[PDB]
Amino acid sequence: MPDLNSSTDSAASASAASDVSVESTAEATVCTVTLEKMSAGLGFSLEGGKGSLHGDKPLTINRIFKGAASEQSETVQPGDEILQLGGTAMQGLTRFEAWNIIKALPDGPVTIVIRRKSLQSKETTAAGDS
């Protein structure tokens, strides 16, 4: 298998990347950051509500603790819809099961990915606007 599949029914995933168009909606922004797994839960806990493949359980940070996120500004956010942690993806995980894979992660840089959409957002790069 050198390149994608070919010489057959034209059916090869293409999609694009790098460049993005179509501005977001309702003001949506993502904040990929790394936490430190050492306080037994990155000092943060996720709350939300699993569903049944028919609704949507956007786990979110509810109880953040003080004792981390000090190596690069605040790497945490309250009520943020974090989709995946340094090792757990909420979208394919229940609330408890989700916060469980993290706790079971190793002791290092836990990568968080949060997309805050809708009002309640103040970080549109205001440190130097033309």
Swiss-Prot record:
Cell location: Secreted
Mutagenesis or variant effect for D9A: Abolishes proteolytic cleavage
PDZ domain location: 32-117
Name of the protein described by the UniProt record: Interleukin-16
Organism placement in taxonomy: Eukaryota, Metazoa, Chordata, Craniata, Vertebrata
Span within the parent record: 1203 to 1332 of 1332
